[PDB]
Amino acid sequence: MVYTADQLTGYTAALEAAFSGRSPKPHVAIGTDMRLPQYIQINGDDRTVGIG
Amino acid sequence: HEFAELFYRTYIVTPDQAGFQLSIRRNLVWEGWTGEGLSGEKQEISKRNILQGLLDYTTLETNSTELIPVIQSGENDEQFIDPSVLPAQTVKQGKDTFDTNFLKFSENGEGFNLLMLAQTPSRLKKGSMTFTDSLDSRIALKQLLISVTKGGTTELFALDVNRDQYAAYTATREYNFRLMQLKFHTSLGLGEESTTVAGAESALLKDLFDLGYRIELDVKVDGEMNVENGNGDTSLRALRLARVFDKEGKEIALTDSRVSAALSGLTVTGVGYSLEARLTNINQLEMGLLIDSDVQKQGFMIPTLPPLVIVKPAMVEDDKTYPRLEALTTAYRIQQMRNNAVTTLLNRADTLKSYLGVGVPHPIESNLGLEGVGQYYVRPYYNEATIDVLNDLNNLTSAAKQTDIQGLIVSKINEMVYTADQLTGYTAALEAAFSGRSPKPHVAIGTDMRLPQYIQINGDDRTVGIGYDYTIARISDLRMKDKIVMTFILPNESEPHPLQHGVLGFIPEYLVDFNMIRNQRIGREIRLTPRYRYFNFLPIMLVINVINLEEAIAQRTALDVNETQVTPAS
Secondary structure, three states, X not given: OHHXXXXXXXXXXXXXXXXXXXXXXXXXXXOOXXXXXXXXXXXXXXXXXXXX | OHHHHHHOEEEEOOOOOOEEEEEEEEEEEEOOOOOOOOOOOOOOOOOEEOHHHHOOOOOOOOOOOEEOXXXXXXXXXXXXXXXXXXXXXXXXXXXXXXXXXXXXXXXXXXXXXXXXXXXXXXXXXXXXXXXXXXXXXXOEEEEEEEEEEEOOEEEEEEEEOOOOOOOEOXXXXXXXXXXXXXXXXXXXXXXXXXOOOOOOOOOOOHHHHHOOEXXXXXXXXXXXXXXXXXXXXXXXXXXXXXXXXXXXXXXXOOOOHHHHHHOOOOEEEEEEEEEEEEEOOOOOOOOOOXXXXXXXXXXXXXXXXXXXXXXXXXXXXXOOOOOOHHHHHHHHXXXXXXXHHHHHHHHHHHHHXXXXXXXXXXXXXXXXXXXXXXXXXXXXXXXXXXXXXXXXXOOOOHHHHHHHHHHHHHHHHHHHHHHHHHHHOHXXXXXXXXXXXXXXXXXXXXXXXXXXXXXXXXXXXXXXXXXXXXXXXXXXXXXXXXXXXXXXXXXXXXXXXXXXXXXXXXXXXXXXXXXXXXXXXXXXXXXXXXXXEEEEOOOEEEEEEEEOXXXXXXXXXXXXXXXXXXXXXX
């Protein structure tokens, strides 16, 4: 989902253009309830929730 | 930008040039001038590039000296077998087209000389047979023909007898010093699967084959031949059935009921023979093959593209209505470095699809509607493939979806690169062009901004394959959705070659500024005059489609299980 949104909205180009010289790394916030993060946090997975 | 550089290496040209031209050398081997109109009445005999012989065996391996008998159709019919047993076989020898048939065995009468018996139309045309024609040190039986008859029906066995232990003429000391002597006293066999002249299996010896039996036939044939005048004769002395063997290999009695039942009434006899001789004629009269040189030289023109221009109110300076030259230059860049490049790339791919078809390798020097000069130096080839990741992925746990998907995609792309290298022989061409660098074809991968994360991999040691160098480029342009563009490009060199993929002709040019009093007003104006052009050379491109990605990740896709029909179905 993060990759698709990035590709469709062209966020990185706008961020790099408006703010010059800084890392073109979008910063992602995820808001949810008390129960989900026990399944989001990873240790031993082949994938983390911060790739890209 | 990286992408424009990756495929089209920019070539700076001094402004005073209408373009640039290249002359390419080709080295050609070809049969030679033959016709009444200098190799054809009005036609030109097809040239062939020498690299074709590297990938083919028909363009070479000429024979021009094979002394084989030729039929004169009503003048020497005594020395050939009756054409009512085996029809004459048309043979292609050099340019000559003539008919052949087996020389018949002579028991008592006069023999034959090979020179008179073998006069091809090339020999008939020119003055005569020459004064000093001598046969080789090696002459051997090429093909012995024997007949199996049972109940009035006959089958012919065109048995290759060359490359046997005892089949080569050897000199002896009983007469003159040039008589080459032949001693054929040995027993050949016939098998369960021995192909016939007609059909594949004999219906008269079928019974022996069914139980798995092979028969041994003893052959005793002698003949004397003279290597200076050609006078020689070969004699069958006795042909008979010698031994019987089965699949296991120990001897099976001839009197036994099964064998003796099937072999009742069976007779074997010889028909003819063929001689393998070549004519070693010092003072050689042979054209062989002619070679030569020629070049194709082409010119490239560079236009002047429509102008990007700025107009501003006069006599004052601004910073919003007239921003700095940065807007001008960025308009320049957005014109050049992405749009025309991707358009010309897609146009090249589409034109290749239209002109060459899919998955078909064409011979060198084919098609003239293609851009560039690569097809003079490498075979044209273009292909595409589609990956249905929804339908083609194999996984076991949902915890490893990405590893499996990357494995699938990378295996497909790597195999595609291998087969593309195979069918075009690119490494051989690179070796021919350069003798100082080992051929390591560098494959440049083009794609949009979403896909590479599934393409960059450490799960598989191969990402483009072992012994291949790769580079990954990204462009955000919308036209490149779900596409993978790959071509063989040479990172090291920066000048045009036929095997170079493409060149971006670039003419640097200045800016003009002045006061333009037109339409009854005044205002300072700024213009641009751009000149460039994208050129295409290499006729190889591969396009991979990646589709159905979203549902593949979001759904279970596992275990194509092929139950093996032990529920009665066959």
